[PDB]
């Protein structure tokens, strides 16, 4: 009898962040070695989802991971990942003039931006003026402005995406070079940074704590040691639901420590609460990595 096994997906979540880098690097070399499989870093309940034809094919893949890339991971695990960024409102000026290639290039724009992290945002308004005249010429420039934007900033996350309004601009007649436009976006972004003050990032995330009591003095202490702000605290038999909130989405080691502290008898659920700022240390970490 034959074995009718088409495509099978398996999750291969790493141990630490070092393993994450190893995995990402492995996915590259492996996909080039054998293009008969697929690997994605998204899904709904996983970190690294790999899919291929035949279970034996999957075994060969996971083998390479631990044997060739020495990455520590667990096959068949759930995980998630996020990252938010936005704050303040203002009017930014954008001017670019150069001539470093025989031809000249010029770009002049005036845009206003506002936050919209409430349940998420994503919007670039047009005022039908500035660098546009015809009615059907408005969606062109508006979409173009976002093209560059996604090349300098991150889009497509929990509570992110800017809401801008194109109200003015000056172009006249010049040459349009991609590299020149992309580098210009980076320059304007730098000018706006020192003016608009880019902080906050990931807001306050409420976390419902659930774990056995009788250790109220120990449990609560471990929570405060994680910058947790407790709102509720009602027991139920032996366990207790400690309705809290911590300004930090995801689980950057939060689950690892909690798992060990509760011996694997502690869980929680994160949810958007209020417009606050994440841990200064982590916030400045990602903002530095994004500028490196």
């Amino acid at each position: 009898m034959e074995f009718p096994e088409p495509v099978i997906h398996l999750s291969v979540e790493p141990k630490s962040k070092a393993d994450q880098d190893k995995m990402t690097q492995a996915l590259v070399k492996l996909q080039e070695e054998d293009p008969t499989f697929h690997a994605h870093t998204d899904e709904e309940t996983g970190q690294v989802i790999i899919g291929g034809m035949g279970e034996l094919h999957l075994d060969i893949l996971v083998d390479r991971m631990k044997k060739e890339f020495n990455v520590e991971c667990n096959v068949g695990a759930p995980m998630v990942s996020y990252r938010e960024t936005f704050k303040s409102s203002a009017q930014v000026q954008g001017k670019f003039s150069r001539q470093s290639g025989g031809r000249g290039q010029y770009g002049d724009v005036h845009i206003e931006f506002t936050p919209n992290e409430t349940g998420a945002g994503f919007e670039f308004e047009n005022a039908i003026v500035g660098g546009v005249v015809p009615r059907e010429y408005i969606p062109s420039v508006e979409a173009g402005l976002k093209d560059a934007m996604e090349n300098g900033v991150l889009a497509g996350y929990p509570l992110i995406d800017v809401k801008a309004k194109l109200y003015d601009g000056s172009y006249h007649d010049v040459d349009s070079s991609e590299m020149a436009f992309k580098i210009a976006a980076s320059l304007a972004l730098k000018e706006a940074a020192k003016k608009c003050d880019p902080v906050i990032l990931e807001p306050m995330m409420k976390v419902t704590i659930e774990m056995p009591e009788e250790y109220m003095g120990d449990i609560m202490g471990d929570v405060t040691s994680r910058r947790g702000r407790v709102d509720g605290m009602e027991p139920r038999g032996n366990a207790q639901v400690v309705n809290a909130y911590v300004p930090l989405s995801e689980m950057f080691g939060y689950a690892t420590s909690l798992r060990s502290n509760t011996q694997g008898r502690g869980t929680y659920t994160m949810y958007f609460d209020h417009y606050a700022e994440v841990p200064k240390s982590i916030a400045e970490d990602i903002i530095k990595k994004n500028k490196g």
Binding site: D42, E44, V80, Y82, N116, T118, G119, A120, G121, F122, E123, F124, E125, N126, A127, I128, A155, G156, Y157, P158, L159, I160, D161, K163, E210, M211, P212, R236, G237, N238, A239, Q240, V241, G264, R265, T267, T269, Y271, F272
Partner: protein, 213 residues
Amino acid sequence: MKTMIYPHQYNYIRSVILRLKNVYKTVNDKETVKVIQSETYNDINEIFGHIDDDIEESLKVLMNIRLSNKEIEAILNKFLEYVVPFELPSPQKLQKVFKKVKKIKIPQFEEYDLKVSSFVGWNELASNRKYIIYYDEKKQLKGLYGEISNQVVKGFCTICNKESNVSLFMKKSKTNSDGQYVKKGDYICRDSIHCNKQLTDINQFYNFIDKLD
């Protein structure tokens, strides 16, 4: 004398089962399981002001640690007696709303899906737009359409306010006499069906509409 008209309540009932059913698998403890059991029991109980013998009996089954999917199916099918499913608007009613949209047609959904959905929103990959039709508190059919990004990322949709594959729903306000308007796009779950089953509260969806204009 049995009469109730609240799709949200029925959806909520099946949604609270998640904090419990998941615990029956992910939680390696018995105390936390009992805690969630208490929550789920009280959650549904608070909805039905006057619980009947069968409702109580069904709740008793939910208290069992060996709550199979078949047992849930029977219970859910029994709860459907206290609610009503959605309705698919006829072409005449649809064209009555989308008077500026010619050649518009609603895709043939499933009966089961129409029993757990409070709003129908299909996406058209022709011009990249999503058409969402529903019924407001006045029992009137209301529908709108908005542009959608040709990309599927992960985020927190304003509607169900959960975590799943989302996209963007861009909608412009009503153009004034001068021809000016305001643009406002928000994150929306691509598959409105999967999003409907994640609708913890209909007010969450209503709030989203309040932000669209």
